[PDB]
Amino acid sequence: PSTLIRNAAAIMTGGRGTADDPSRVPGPDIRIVGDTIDAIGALAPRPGETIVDATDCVIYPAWVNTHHHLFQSLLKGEPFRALFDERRFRLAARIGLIELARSGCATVADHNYVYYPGMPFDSSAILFEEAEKLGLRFVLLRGGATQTRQLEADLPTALRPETLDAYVADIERLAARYHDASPRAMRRVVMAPTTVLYSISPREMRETAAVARRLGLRMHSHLSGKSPVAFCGEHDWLGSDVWYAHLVKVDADEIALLAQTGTGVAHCPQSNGRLPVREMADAGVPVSIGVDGAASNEAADMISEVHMTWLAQRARLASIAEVIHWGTAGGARVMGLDEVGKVAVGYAADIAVYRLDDPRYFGLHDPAIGPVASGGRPSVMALFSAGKRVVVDDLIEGVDIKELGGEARRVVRELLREVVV
Ligand SMILES: [Zn+2]
């Protein structure tokens, strides 16, 4: 159980780029023993060891997606939810998970909120099952609401809120069943009421925070008396413990509070368009990257996202390393997976090896920059998750692309037919 990635053209560390924490390590080979990075730079092969020739290839740490809505992978077009079932939910998750894996992402976090009294299937179960079939680390962001006042009788089974205790109960169940607290867990669970300032009562967000903290879990939510951030603070919803998605429009005072509390953000540019950053980053608040639900982001893969992130940061005249950090080690520390997100000895072996065999890369003075700046989608000759090869030249064990294609095309038709009713 040893492997040697040899002769890499470039190696980005996902580091903050300082002298203490370098963003690029000019070194050439990488040894992996088990699930850990054993060494970096000038290594001689070993007898019977596995060898992967990364000649002309660029190495990056696998991506860490900190926000998503996988069911939406079958709702790509526009904004249905009540029509999801066993088969379907499973398909949407597989699809989005697959396209995420071939974009070099090894750690996915889904803000799942399909839950309702009497649901015939276990969403959470399905999500962890699929993630693992692919060999990916999964982070469950158990979402939901206790209110809605769209009323009720004019709301079907699927869209009805869950009583506060039902929610809490479920999380304890999930916390005990799947959550591993190591900083390199392959499974995680977090307290994530959809839009905390709406999905739940403010008295409920306090108690809801207490349970999460009591179970040693992190908190996450969509952040749409006084200021929103200031309100969250007053209801036990800030701290390096918590991180928010979709937080566009933020006061200077609000940024400071995020900076002092250590509350992170899940930056989603492509999605946020259908609706800042380097101020929060400068303020010191942790920044991570996510792509949420194909319903708001048709290009739900970490490469398209990272590309948009970089371009938008160039708009305000923001390096590639800067962004690679956000998409890797930055997201890891936001979700508490501290031994993940860095191509450094001692860390978990989650590595992406890209082959720039596409003409868009032909002519790059710094070929290392390609995966983020060239657009398109580099060829994953190799993806490693916990030291295991999940991808071999864009191929994943268990996936038949044409097959998966036909399935989705069929379900979408069914879906489209059914909404008419
Ligand atoms: Zn979202």
Ligand 1 centre from 48 Cα, in Å? 46
Side chain identity at residue 356, one-letter code: L
Question: How far is the centre of ligand 1, averaged over its atoms, from the C-alpha of 19 (Å)?
Answer: 36
Any idea what the Cα angle at residue 205 is, between residues 93 and 142, rounded to 5°?
Answer: 15
Q: Are 86 and 160 in a shared domain? A: yes
The rounded distance, in Å, linking the Cα atoms of 286 and 383 is: 26
How are beta strands 50-53 and 58-61 bridged, if at all?
A: unpaired
DSSP 187: E
Here the CATH number for the domain that contains residue 372 is 2.30.40.10
Cα 214 to Cα 183, 192, 211, distances in angstroms: 18, 15, 5
In a shared domain, residues 186 and 244: yes
Among 309, 338, 367, the domain-final residue is: 338
Strand partners, 388: 385
Which residues have CB under 8 Å from 62's CB, separation 6+?
104, 105, 106, 107, 328, 350, 351, 352, 383, 384, 385
Q: How far is the CA of 217 from the centre of ligand 1 (A)?
A: 20
Q: How far is the CA of 271 from the centre of ligand 1 (A)?
A: 8
Q: How many A from CA of 123 to the centre of ligand 1?
A: 17
Q: Of 151, 95, 120, nearest to 396 (Cα)?
A: 95
Q: How far is the CA of 256 from the centre of ligand 1 (A)?
A: 24
Cα–Cα distance between 317 and 314 in angstroms, integer?
5
Which CATH number do you get for residue 327? Answer: 3.20.20.140
Q: Where residue 418 sits, what CATH number does that domain have?
A: 1.20.5.140
The technique by which this structure was obtained is X-ray
What's the token pair of residue 259?
């900076």
* Cβ contact 110:291 at 8 Å: no
- State residue 333 phi and psi, 5-degree precision: -70, -20
Are 177 and 89 in a shared domain?
Answer: yes
263 and 296 within one domain? yes
Structure tokens at 21: 């924490």
The verdict on 77 and 121 lying in the same domain is: yes
Q: What is the resolution of this structure in A?
A: 2.7
Ligand 1 centroid–CA 247 distance in Å is 10
* CA 46 to ligand 1 center in whole angstroms: 46
How is the chain split among helix, strand and coil, in percent rounded to 5?
Answer: 35, 20, 45
**Domain shared by 1 and 68, yes or no:** no
Backbone angles phi, psi at 170, to 5 degrees: -60, -40
Q: Are residues 106 and 133 in the same domain?
A: yes
Q: Are residues 310 and 189 in the same domain?
A: yes
CA 156 to chain centroid: 30
> From the CA of 266, how far away is ligand 1's center (Å)?
9
276 and 132, same structural domain? yes
Give me ligand 1 centre to Cα 297, in Å: 10
| Same domain flag for 87 and 211 | yes
Q: Are residues 278 and 155 in the same domain?
A: yes
Question: Residues near 226 by Cβ (< 8 Å), separated by ≥ 6?
Answer: none
List C-alpha distances in Å: 246 to 110, 154, 270, 275, 282: 14, 29, 11, 9, 19
In the structure, ligand 1 is a single-atom ion and the residues with CB under 5 Å from it are 292
Considering the domain architecture, whether residues 76 and 141 belong to the same structural domain is answered as yes
Its domain, for residue 28, covers 1-62+339-395
One-letter amino acid of 339: E
Question: Into how many domains does the chain fold?
Answer: 3
Residue type, 413: R
Where does a domain end: 338, 359, 377?
A: 338
Greatest Cα pair distance, the chain, in angstroms, is 69
Q: Which residues contact 372 (CB under 8 A, 6 or more apart)?
A: 303, 306, 307, 310, 320, 323, 324
347 alpha carbon – ligand 1 mean position (Å):
29
Query: Residue 398: what residue type?
Result: G
